[PDB]
Amino acid sequence: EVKLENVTENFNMWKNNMVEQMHEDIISLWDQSLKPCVKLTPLCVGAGSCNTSVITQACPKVSFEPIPIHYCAPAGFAILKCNDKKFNGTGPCTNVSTVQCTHGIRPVVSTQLLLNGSLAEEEIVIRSENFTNNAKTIIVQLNESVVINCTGAGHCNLSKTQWENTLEQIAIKLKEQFGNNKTIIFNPSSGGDPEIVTHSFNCGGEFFYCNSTQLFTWNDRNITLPCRIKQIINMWQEVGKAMYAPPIRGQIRCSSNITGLLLTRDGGKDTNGTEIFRPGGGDMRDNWRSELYKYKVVKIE
Amino acid sequence: XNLHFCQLRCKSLGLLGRCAXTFCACX
Amino acid sequence: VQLVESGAEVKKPGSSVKVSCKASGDTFIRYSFTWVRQAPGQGLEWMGRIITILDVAHYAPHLQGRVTITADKSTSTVYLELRNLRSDDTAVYFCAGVYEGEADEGEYDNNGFLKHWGQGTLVTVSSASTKGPSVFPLAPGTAALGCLVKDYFPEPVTVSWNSGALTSGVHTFPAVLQSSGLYSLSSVVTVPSSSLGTQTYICNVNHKPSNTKVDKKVEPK
Amino acid sequence: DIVMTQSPATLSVSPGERATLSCRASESVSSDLAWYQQKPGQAPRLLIYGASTRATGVPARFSGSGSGAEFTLTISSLQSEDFAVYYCQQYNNWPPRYTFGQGTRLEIKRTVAAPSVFIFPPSDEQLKSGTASVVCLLNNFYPREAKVQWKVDNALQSGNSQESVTEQDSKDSTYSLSSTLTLSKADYEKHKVYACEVTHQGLSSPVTKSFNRG
Ligand SMILES: *[C@@H]1O[C@H](CO)[C@@H](O)[C@H](O)[C@H]1NC(C)=O
Ligand SMILES: *[C@@H]1O[C@H](CO)[C@@H](O)[C@H](O)[C@H]1NC(C)=O
Ligand SMILES: *[C@@H]1O[C@H](CO)[C@@H](O)[C@H](O)[C@H]1NC(C)=O
Ligand SMILES: *[C@@H]1O[C@H](CO)[C@@H](O)[C@H](O)[C@H]1NC(C)=O
Ligand SMILES: *[C@@H]1O[C@H](CO)[C@@H](O)[C@H](O)[C@H]1NC(C)=O
Ligand SMILES: *[C@@H]1O[C@H](CO)[C@@H](O)[C@H](O)[C@H]1NC(C)=O
Ligand SMILES: *[C@@H]1O[C@H](CO)[C@@H](O)[C@H](O)[C@H]1NC(C)=O
Ligand SMILES: *[C@H]1O[C@H](CO)[C@@H](O)[C@H](O)[C@H]1NC(C)=O
């Protein structure tokens, strides 16, 4: 009389400890392969008074190629995988499966654009821990890559029509979410640290910073952006500044596949039947979630 | 992130400041 | 791009000195500055360097926190502070700097060499109080004669013969530091014997530190 | 601790000829090596950096060469302005602990000249003071190496004299030296013969200058 049944499981991409583990890990990889020559961080005490802390250590420049990694289950636990089409990232998943390790990942620290990640199978998908709350970040997962090549000549090249179609489809998916009669507009960052304002990323150890204004100025040939390689930056691992050594080889290049975006929607509390979206990012944890949203580690019971 | 200095600077520009991981962002 | 340093200094053992280096001509925050010392008769010594834009200074080990290098972005001025000074800290202190790139835009070469240099600042550490020199004559074809400038403090001292009219054959030796802590040197010149008796030879000794100007006649008699 | 060694300490070379200075690092320094020139009473000047890159405003006769822990500075035609002291410096380690070489003094090569020697007894004015300085002078000689021997009543002296040498004369490329025998007036008056014996490459035999107190 016993009935056979599939095991339904509940996922929450916004509360996945795999994210914190990866975050801790990428930090460990960097602390052992991309150490700063000088590091300045805030050193405080109870009362609330702080003095700057400075650390000087060896900072050897090294050639850096992408090493594919993945997370596997320790004896005793299993990794669940949601296979649902257009899975939201939270709620129960009907067609789930198990894997020993997650798919191979080529992690990239960046902002505004997600580089070299996994693409969506069907159409574009957008996910947020809460679309109504405008303080929460919107992760856009593309289903079609948009290549972007950069040169040491401070400029990255991006296909304009390719990229304009992308904003078109991204915009279309936002409507399905915020309303089919609402007006979708893309505006540049509202400001903050240079890491937040520009599209910044690390390619082979070098820290690039590109003006992204041309990418987020849109209403519903190539696109060359002004880029810069910096030696002095603000850290993504902790609050503080770091200084790295200059580049080794004269010409520094970089080829990356744009696979997603980090957006925010302006809290347009005012009645207007229009929504504004700007480049987001900053917490590298959202970069980790965009790849781990379909997994959930659990105990074998 | 240093929220204090973050709000301060953003505020001098008619915007509020909020942390974005370890970075400062102006809304 | 110019570097100018404050004047000479005479310090008492256990005291502190703060030399300054006024930079000008370009964007202050785009340079890193170094301090180099050179004791009398010695070679150059690297003391430390400050990454101005970051406001971070690195130093030479054997200094044991007695030195502190600071910068003042407001006036484009670098400073060298040395504490609990000892006699052997006596030397010329050199200030220097190099262009690092667009530091303000985040670019930085971290160049460790020294392109621009100040004039140097002499710092003498001694328990001695300023003392004008005593000038004694070194009495005589070719005749040699001269002046002994003994027991003065501190350096330097200037010596001339006949107010600068006599320069050929003049030899003014580098000063020597005596056990007493005071300096002493000699100035000599060779002249023809036939000149004695008709012409006069006078050594003029100027010691700025004690505002003393002394002239002495040297005769064979 | 990275040590930089320069050789030779002193190099003599005829004007218009070629000079080659050596610098060695106790370990690898890559190319972070610089060369400086310093004339007496003046601040150093940057000549080369990055081992071979020549600074702006620096004659083309000055060329840098080297890599790893072995470097060389070359001057193809020594001009009067090129005779000075040269220092090498490394700035490759980090944390930074940059260091300089002990220096290589470049001096003018000329023919041997014997010195003229002179001895000066103390003045009456100095004796009234309570001290006595017997001075011995070596006028215009070459090379810079010489030996001054002090004798008091035919007794070899030692530990009570001080020497001072001038820079190389810019007109005849020679050197002058003084030797000062310091004694208390008390000791000076208890002796009679004060002699200064000079030895030099240009003197076939030692030259002695002396006097008798009074
Ligand atoms: C679950 O799997 C079936 C079989 O392939 C598929 O038809 C269905 O659409 C899937 N449902 C979801 C939520 O993707
Ligand atoms: C995400 O999708 C699930 C199922 O499609 C739905 O229950 C949920 O309300 C959506 N938004 C949230 C809360 O993440
Ligand atoms: C698992 O069983 C559920 C319940 O009928 C069904 O909806 C789902 O498609 C099944 N998933 C698969 C493909 O095992
Ligand atoms: C990607 O999705 C968009 C809609 O979101 C659709 O127009 C396009 O055809 C899809 N392309 C592929 C190859 O999936
Ligand atoms: C989502 O955010 C909105 C604010 O825009 C808030 O009103 C709502 O309570 C949130 N939804 C929940 C229950 O998480
Ligand atoms: C981007 O660069 C890669 C190699 O670096 C090349 O394969 C690709 O075609 C480039 N994209 C284009 C077509 O500009
Ligand atoms: C993106 O992936 C390509 C493919 O190997 C790689 O060359 C590039 O370095 C990656 N971009 C990054 C990590 O910035
Ligand atoms: C980058 O380009 C935009 C558009 O020309 C310009 O307004 C801005 O000053 C530049 N800096 C930014 C926004 O990063």
User: D11 and D86 share a domain?
Assistant: yes
Q: In this structure, what are the phi and psi dihedrals at residue C182, rounded to the nearest 5 degrees?
A: -100, 155
Angle at the Cα of D197 from the Cα atoms of D196 and D203, rounded to 5 degrees: 135
Residue type at D198 in one-letter notation: V
Which residues line ligand 8 at a C-beta cut-off of 6 Å? A 197-198, 211, 213, 226
Residue C94's domain comprises 1-127
Residues in CB range of C198: below 8 A, 6 or more apart: none
User: D129 and D100 share a domain?
Assistant: no
Residues C58 and A44: their CA atoms lie apart, in Å, by 23
Q: Taken in order A136, A137, A141, A142, is the CA torsion positive or negative?
A: positive
Burial call C45-79: b when 16+ CB within 10 Å, e when fewer: bbbbbbbbbbebbbbbeeeeeebbbebeeeebbbb
Q: What is the DSSP secondary structure assignment for residue A166, as one 8-state letter? A: H
How many other C-beta atoms lie within 10 A of the C-beta of residue A301?
A: 4
User: C12 and C95 share a domain?
Assistant: yes
For ligand 2, atom 1: residue with the closest CA:
A88
Boundary of a domain, candidates C127, C145, C180: C127
Q: Is A47 exposed, middle or buried (0-12, 13-18, 19+ CB in 10 A)?
A: exposed
Neighbors of chain C by Cβ distance (3+ pairs < 8 Å): A, D
Ligand 2 pocket test, pick from A90, A125, A128, A173 with the greatest ligand atom count within 8 Å of Cβ, gives A90
Residue B12's domain comprises 2-27
User: D88 and D37 share a domain?
Assistant: yes
User: C160 and C111 share a domain?
Assistant: no
Q: Which two tokens stand for residue C120?
A: 């140097």
User: D117 and D105 share a domain?
Assistant: no
User: C77 and C106 share a domain?
Assistant: yes
Among C112, C117, C118, beta carbon nearest to D96: C112
Residues of C in contact with D164 (CB under 8 A): 173-176, 185-186
Residues in CB range of C74: below 8 A, 6 or more apart: none
Q: What is the DSSP secondary structure assignment for residue A118, as one 8-state letter? A: P
Boundary of a domain, candidates C80, C104, C127: C127
Residues C5 and C13: their CA atoms lie apart, in Å, by 22
User: C85 and C27 share a domain?
Assistant: yes
Q: CB distance from D110 to chain C under 8 Å? A: no
Domain count, chain D: 2
Between the CA of residue C76 and those of A168, C51, D192, what are the distances in Å?
A: 52, 13, 64
Between the CA of residue A123 and those of A126, A142, A276, C176, D103, what are the distances in Å?
A: 10, 8, 22, 89, 72
Interaxial angle between packed helices A17-33 and A285-292, expressed in degrees from 0 to 180 and rounded to the nearest 10: 120
* Token pair 């003042």 in the structure block, residue: C72
Q: CB distance from A57 to chain D under 8 Å? A: yes
Q: Which of C156, C143, C133, C157 is nearest to C201 (CA)?
A: C143
What's the CA-to-centroid distance between A129 and ligand 5, angstroms?
10
Alpha helices (runs of H) in chain A, residue ranges in sequence order: 17-33, 160-178, 194-197, 285-292
Between the CA of residue D160 and those of C66, C134, D85, D150, what are the distances in Å?
A: 36, 21, 31, 9
User: C85 and C104 share a domain?
Assistant: yes
Q: CB distance from A96 to chain C under 8 Å? A: no
CATH of the domain at A12: 2.170.40.20
User: D103 and D191 share a domain?
Assistant: no
For every residue of chain D, DSSP letters joined together read ---EEEE-SEEEE-TTS-EEEEEEESS--TT-EEEEEE-TTS--EEEEETTTEEPTT--TTEEEEEETTEEEEEESS--GGG-SEEEEEE---SS---EE---EEEEE----BPPEEEEEPPPHHHHHHTEEEEEEEEEEEBSS-EEEEEEETTEE--SSEEEEE-PPPTTT--EEEEEEEEEEHHHHTT--EEEEEEEETT-SS-EEEEEE--
Residues D168 and D84: their CA atoms lie apart, in Å, by 10
Contact A275, A183 (CB under 8 A): yes
Q: In this structure, what are the phi and psi dihedrals at residue C52, rounded to the nearest 5 degrees?
A: -45, -60
Residues B6 and B26: their CA atoms lie apart, in Å, by 8
Domain count, chain A: 1
CATH of the domain at D135: 2.60.40.10
Say how far residue A71 (Cα) sits from the centre of its chain.
18
- Any idea how long chain D is? 214
Ligand 5 pocket test, pick from A129, A130, A265 with the greatest ligand atom count within 8 Å of Cβ, gives A130
Find out whether the beta carbon of A267 lies less than 6 Å from any atom of ligand 5: no
What's the CA-to-centroid distance between A10 and ligand 5, angstroms?
20
Q: Which of C13, C5, C211 is nearest to C124 (CA)?
A: C13
Q: CB distance from A267 to chain B under 8 Å? A: yes
User: C37 and C144 share a domain?
Assistant: no
Q: Is C159 exposed, middle or buried (0-12, 13-18, 19+ CB in 10 A)?
A: buried
| Breaks in chain A after residues, C-to-N cutoff 2.5 Å | 220
Q: Which of A219, A253, A225, A289 is nearest to A63 (CA)?
A: A253
Q: In this structure, what are the phi and psi dihedrals at residue D138, rounded to the nearest 5 degrees?
A: -115, 105
Which ligand has the shortest distance to the CA of A26?
Answer: 7
Among A38, A54, A231, beta carbon nearest to C106: A231
- Any idea how long chain C is? 221
User: D101 and D6 share a domain?
Assistant: yes
Neighbors of chain B by Cβ distance (3+ pairs < 8 Å): A
* B24/chain A closest Cα distance in angstroms: 5
Q: Taken in order D27, D28, D29, D33, is the CA torsion positive or negative?
A: positive
**According to the entry, how was the structure determined?**
X-ray
Q: CB distance from A268 to chain B under 8 Å? A: no
Contact C103, C53 (CB under 8 A): yes
User: D101 and D149 share a domain?
Assistant: no
Q: CB distance from A147 to chain C under 8 Å? A: no
For this entry, resolution in Å reads 2.4
H or E element at residue C81: strand C77-82
Residues B23 and A17: their CA atoms lie apart, in Å, by 22
Beta-carbon separation of D95 and A56 below 8 A: yes
Q: Which two tokens stand for residue A24?
A: 């801790």
Residues in CB range of C32: below 8 A, 6 or more apart: C49, C50, C51, C52, C97, C98, C100, C110, C111
User: D116 and D203 share a domain?
Assistant: yes
Residues A300 and A294: their CA atoms lie apart, in Å, by 18
Contact A80, A296 (CB under 8 A): yes
Q: CB distance from A49 to chain B under 8 Å? A: no
User: C115 and C155 share a domain?
Assistant: no
User: C104 and C116 share a domain?
Assistant: yes
Q: Do chains D and A touch (3 or more CB pairs under 8 A)?
A: yes
Q: Is A227 exposed, middle or buried (0-12, 13-18, 19+ CB in 10 A)?
A: buried
Q: In this structure, what are the phi and psi dihedrals at residue D24, rounded to the nearest 5 degrees?
A: -130, 135
Q: CB distance from D178 to chain C under 8 Å? A: yes
Residue D10's domain comprises 1-110
Q: Which two tokens stand for residue A69?
A: 């990694």
CATH of the domain at C208: 2.60.40.10
Domain count, chain C: 2
The C-alpha torsion from A283 through A287 and A288 to A294, rounded to 10°, is: 130
Boundary of a domain, candidates C127, C159, C182: C127
User: D93 and D16 share a domain?
Assistant: yes
* D172/chain C closest Cα distance in angstroms: 11
Contact D60, D54 (CB under 8 A): yes
For every residue of A204-268, DSSP letters joined together read TTEEEEE--GGGS-EE--EEEEEEEEESEEE-SSSSSEEE-PPPSSS---EEEEEEEEEEEE---
Between the CA of residue C45 and those of A179, D5, D80, D93, what are the distances in Å?
A: 72, 14, 27, 16
For ligand 1, atom 3: residue with the closest CA:
A95
- Any idea how long chain A is? 301
Boundary of a domain, candidates D84, D110, D136: D110
How many other C-beta atoms lie within 10 A of the C-beta of residue A167?
A: 19
Residue A178's domain comprises 1-301
Q: Taken in order C190, C193, C199, C205, is the CA torsion positive or negative?
A: positive
Q: Which two tokens stand for residue D68?
A: 């790893």
Residue type at A168 in one-letter notation: E
Residues of A in contact with D95 (CB under 8 A): 56-58
For every residue of C116-185, DSSP letters joined together read EE---EEEEE-SPPPBPPEEEEE---EEEEEEEEEEEBSS--EEEEGGGTB-TT-EEPPPEE-TTS-EEE
Strand partners, A242: A39, A233
- Any idea how long chain B is? 27
Residues of C in contact with D95 (CB under 8 A): 58
Residues D97 and D90: their CA atoms lie apart, in Å, by 9
Contact D199, D177 (CB under 8 A): no
Residues of B in contact with A282 (CB under 8 A): 20-23, 25
